[PDB]
Design a protein around this motif. Sequence first.
Motif, PDB file in Angstrom:
ATOM      1  N   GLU A  30       0.844  -1.184   0.000  1.00 50.55           N
ATOM      2  CA  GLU A  30       0.000   0.000   0.000  1.00 50.55           C
ATOM      3  C   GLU A  30       0.886   1.242   0.000  1.00 50.55           C
ATOM      4  O   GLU A  30       0.556   2.248  -0.622  1.00 50.55           O
ATOM      5  CB  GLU A  30      -0.916   0.023   1.227  1.00 50.55           C
ATOM      6  N   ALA A  31       2.011   1.160   0.701  1.00 57.84           N
ATOM      7  CA  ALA A  31       2.953   2.270   0.781  1.00 57.84           C
ATOM      8  C   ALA A  31       3.641   2.451  -0.569  1.00 57.84           C
ATOM      9  O   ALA A  31       3.820   3.577  -1.039  1.00 57.84           O
ATOM     10  CB  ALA A  31       3.991   2.000   1.873  1.00 57.84           C
ATOM     11  N   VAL A  32       4.023   1.339  -1.193  1.00 57.68           N
ATOM     12  CA  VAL A  32       4.678   1.404  -2.492  1.00 57.68           C
ATOM     13  C   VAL A  32       3.732   2.016  -3.521  1.00 57.68           C
ATOM     14  O   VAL A  32       4.137   2.861  -4.317  1.00 57.68           O
ATOM     15  CB  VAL A  32       5.106   0.004  -2.993  1.00 57.68           C
ATOM     16  N   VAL A  33       2.476   1.579  -3.501  1.00 58.67           N
ATOM     17  CA  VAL A  33       1.475   2.077  -4.433  1.00 58.67           C
ATOM     18  C   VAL A  33       1.253   3.578  -4.248  1.00 58.67           C
ATOM     19  O   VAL A  33       1.191   4.325  -5.226  1.00 58.67           O
ATOM     20  CB  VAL A  33       0.127   1.330  -4.257  1.00 58.67           C
ATOM     21  N   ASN A  34       1.136   4.016  -2.997  1.00 52.99           N
ATOM     22  CA  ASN A  34       0.925   5.429  -2.715  1.00 52.99           C
ATOM     23  C   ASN A  34       2.157   6.239  -3.098  1.00 52.99           C
ATOM     24  O   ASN A  34       2.058   7.413  -3.444  1.00 52.99           O
ATOM     25  CB  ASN A  34       0.622   5.644  -1.234  1.00 52.99           C
ATOM     26  N   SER A  35       3.322   5.604  -3.030  1.00 58.12           N
ATOM     27  CA  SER A  35       4.575   6.263  -3.360  1.00 58.12           C
ATOM     28  C   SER A  35       4.691   6.479  -4.858  1.00 58.12           C
ATOM     29  O   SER A  35       4.981   7.585  -5.325  1.00 58.12           O
ATOM     30  CB  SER A  35       5.756   5.416  -2.884  1.00 58.12           C
ATOM     31  N   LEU A  36       4.466   5.408  -5.609  1.00 52.80           N
ATOM     32  CA  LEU A  36       4.561   5.461  -7.054  1.00 52.80           C
ATOM     33  C   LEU A  36       3.531   6.413  -7.644  1.00 52.80           C
ATOM     34  O   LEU A  36       3.763   7.022  -8.686  1.00 52.80           O
ATOM     35  CB  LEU A  36       4.400   4.054  -7.638  1.00 52.80           C
ATOM     36  N   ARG A  37       2.400   6.564  -6.969  1.00 50.50           N
ATOM     37  CA  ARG A  37       1.359   7.460  -7.457  1.00 50.50           C
ATOM     38  C   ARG A  37       1.841   8.913  -7.483  1.00 50.50           C
ATOM     39  O   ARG A  37       1.438   9.693  -8.340  1.00 50.50           O
ATOM     40  CB  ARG A  37       0.109   7.340  -6.584  1.00 50.50           C
ATOM     41  N   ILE A  38       2.704   9.269  -6.541  1.00 51.51           N
ATOM     42  CA  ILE A  38       3.240  10.615  -6.472  1.00 51.51           C
ATOM     43  C   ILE A  38       3.997  10.920  -7.758  1.00 51.51           C
ATOM     44  O   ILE A  38       4.067  12.069  -8.193  1.00 51.51           O
ATOM     45  CB  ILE A  38       4.225  10.759  -5.293  1.00 51.51           C
ATOM     46  N   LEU A  39       4.569   9.882  -8.357  1.00 52.42           N
ATOM     47  CA  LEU A  39       5.352  10.038  -9.575  1.00 52.42           C
ATOM     48  C   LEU A  39       4.525   9.829 -10.838  1.00 52.42           C
ATOM     49  O   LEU A  39       5.062   9.789 -11.943  1.00 52.42           O
ATOM     50  CB  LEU A  39       6.541   9.075  -9.548  1.00 52.42           C
ATOM     51  N   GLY A  40       3.214   9.707 -10.663  1.00 52.09           N
ATOM     52  CA  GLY A  40       2.327   9.528 -11.794  1.00 52.09           C
ATOM     53  C   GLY A  40       2.243   8.106 -12.299  1.00 52.09           C
ATOM     54  O   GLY A  40       1.630   7.857 -13.336  1.00 52.09           O
ATOM     55  N   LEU A  41       2.855   7.170 -11.575  1.00 59.27           N
ATOM     56  CA  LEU A  41       2.835   5.767 -11.979  1.00 59.27           C
ATOM     57  C   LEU A  41       1.805   4.984 -11.168  1.00 59.27           C
ATOM     58  O   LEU A  41       1.943   4.819  -9.956  1.00 59.27           O
ATOM     59  CB  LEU A  41       4.225   5.146 -11.809  1.00 59.27           C
ATOM     60  N   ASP A  42       0.766   4.511 -11.846  1.00 60.28           N
ATOM     61  CA  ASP A  42      -0.301   3.757 -11.203  1.00 60.28           C
ATOM     62  C   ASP A  42      -0.002   2.261 -11.229  1.00 60.28           C
ATOM     63  O   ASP A  42      -0.137   1.613 -12.263  1.00 60.28           O
ATOM     64  CB  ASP A  42      -1.628   4.068 -11.907  1.00 60.28           C
ATOM     65  N   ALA A  43       0.414   1.716 -10.090  1.00 64.94           N
ATOM     66  CA  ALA A  43       0.744   0.300  -9.998  1.00 64.94           C
ATOM     67  C   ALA A  43      -0.153  -0.423  -9.004  1.00 64.94           C
ATOM     68  O   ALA A  43      -0.899   0.205  -8.255  1.00 64.94           O
ATOM     69  CB  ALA A  43       2.208   0.126  -9.611  1.00 64.94           C
ATOM     70  N   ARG A  44      -0.075  -1.749  -8.997  1.00 65.05           N
ATOM     71  CA  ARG A  44      -0.903  -2.551  -8.098  1.00 65.05           C
ATOM     72  C   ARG A  44      -0.209  -3.848  -7.710  1.00 65.05           C
ATOM     73  O   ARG A  44       0.714  -4.305  -8.385  1.00 65.05           O
ATOM     74  CB  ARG A  44      -2.227  -2.891  -8.784  1.00 65.05           C
ATOM     75  N   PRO A  45      -0.638  -4.454  -6.603  1.00 65.39           N
ATOM     76  CA  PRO A  45      -0.017  -5.712  -6.184  1.00 65.39           C
ATOM     77  C   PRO A  45      -0.522  -6.872  -7.033  1.00 65.39           C
ATOM     78  O   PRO A  45      -1.613  -6.799  -7.599  1.00 65.39           O
ATOM     79  CB  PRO A  45      -0.429  -5.829  -4.717  1.00 65.39           C
ATOM     80  N   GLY A  46       0.277  -7.929  -7.138  1.00 69.69           N
ATOM     81  CA  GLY A  46      -0.128  -9.090  -7.915  1.00 69.69           C
ATOM     82  C   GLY A  46      -1.336  -9.738  -7.268  1.00 69.69           C
ATOM     83  O   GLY A  46      -1.806  -9.277  -6.230  1.00 69.69           O
ATOM     84  N   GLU A  47      -1.832 -10.826  -7.841  1.00 72.33           N
ATOM     85  CA  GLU A  47      -3.018 -11.453  -7.275  1.00 72.33           C
ATOM     86  C   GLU A  47      -2.922 -12.891  -6.789  1.00 72.33           C
ATOM     87  O   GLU A  47      -3.746 -13.321  -5.990  1.00 72.33           O
ATOM     88  CB  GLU A  47      -4.159 -11.332  -8.283  1.00 72.33           C
ATOM     89  N   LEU A  48      -1.913 -13.626  -7.242  1.00 77.13           N
ATOM     90  CA  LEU A  48      -1.768 -15.032  -6.872  1.00 77.13           C
ATOM     91  C   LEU A  48      -0.903 -15.365  -5.659  1.00 77.13           C
ATOM     92  O   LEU A  48       0.074 -14.677  -5.360  1.00 77.13           O
ATOM     93  CB  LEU A  48      -1.230 -15.810  -8.073  1.00 77.13           C
ATOM     94  N   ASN A  49      -1.279 -16.441  -4.972  1.00 79.57           N
ATOM     95  CA  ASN A  49      -0.538 -16.939  -3.817  1.00 79.57           C
ATOM     96  C   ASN A  49       0.207 -18.188  -4.264  1.00 79.57           C
ATOM     97  O   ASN A  49      -0.182 -19.309  -3.933  1.00 79.57           O
ATOM     98  CB  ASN A  49      -1.472 -17.314  -2.665  1.00 79.57           C
ATOM     99  N   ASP A  50       1.269 -17.992  -5.034  1.00 71.50           N
ATOM    100  CA  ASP A  50       2.070 -19.102  -5.529  1.00 71.50           C
ATOM    101  C   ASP A  50       3.511 -18.626  -5.630  1.00 71.50           C
ATOM    102  O   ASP A  50       3.888 -17.955  -6.589  1.00 71.50           O
ATOM    103  CB  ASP A  50       1.573 -19.546  -6.910  1.00 71.50           C
ATOM    104  N   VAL A  51       4.304 -18.982  -4.632  1.00 70.14           N
ATOM    105  CA  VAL A  51       5.709 -18.604  -4.567  1.00 70.14           C
ATOM    106  C   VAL A  51       6.536 -19.108  -5.751  1.00 70.14           C
ATOM    107  O   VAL A  51       7.602 -18.566  -6.042  1.00 70.14           O
ATOM    108  CB  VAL A  51       6.336 -19.125  -3.245  1.00 70.14           C
TER     109      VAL A  51
END
Length: 247
Positions: free
Chosen positions: A108-129
């Motif tokens: 959530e911190a990374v996402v909010n951080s990247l947003r400051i730079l205009g980059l809209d990112a998101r976390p992956g979705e799968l639970n498979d190491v």
Amino acid sequence: MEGRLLLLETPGNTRMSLAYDEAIYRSFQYGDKPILRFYRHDRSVIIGYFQVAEEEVDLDYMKKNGIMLARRYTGGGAVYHDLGDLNFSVVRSSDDMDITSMFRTMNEAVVNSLRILGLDARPGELNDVSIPVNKKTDIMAGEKKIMGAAGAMRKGAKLWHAAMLVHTDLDMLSAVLKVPSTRERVANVTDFVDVSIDEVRNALIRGFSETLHIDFREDTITEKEESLARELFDKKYSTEEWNMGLL
Ligand SMILES: [N]C1=N[C]=NC2=C1N=[C]N2[C]1O[C]([C]OP([O])(=O)/O=C(\[O])[C][C][C][C][C]2[C][C]SS2)[C]([O])[C]1[O]
Ligand SMILES: [Mg+2]
């Protein structure tokens, strides 16, 4: 609500850098000031705790290309680092063993951080190491992976560190990592926005401070931590058995 920002870096010697990481993590005592560290490594390949070097990389490509080999103390897969990659660690007191929340809160911190730079990112979705991308520990931009992460937890403390591709040579990373296409699944933050490592680092400082509500003030590593790192290095990270994955 106050924390330590450590610009503790050791390019040229990835193994000593990782020793610093584990040192700040292992010295930490419940109640200490939270820690956020930023560091870069020169051309390197970092494998996970449960990994075997010869199974993840080509001891030749690296040999011939001056690629440093090193194994971190946290689990996860193998990644390629260069000065175009920005790594960073978080160490805080822990009152539980809930790994999912750590990763969830840090993303959530990374996402909010990247947003400051205009980059809209998101976390992956799968639970498979075992899968290279799209995991909940991964941060995606578009359909590409730009950051991977790993962590550790022990009584009183938790650790979370990630590798973010800013302007890394992706062709290089793809050529050295054994997987089984890789070039087509990753991306640099700069493929999206023209920002510098400092700009990215400064964005993350804000993001993490705002999300975690911690005022990270620039600080230096202590002699105690600096000594433990020197010992972890000489006794472990400097050995072949450890970096090959045997120890
Ligand atoms: N650098 C980087 N970033 C992001 N991504 C990447 C890199 N390299 C490579 N890559 C990619 O990814 C993958 C992998 O998977 P995983 O298992 O998830 O891994 C990870 O992410 C781990 C984490 C790390 C952390 C840091 C390091 C040292 S200390 S911090 C591969 O294969 C590819 O595709
Ligand atoms: Mg990951």
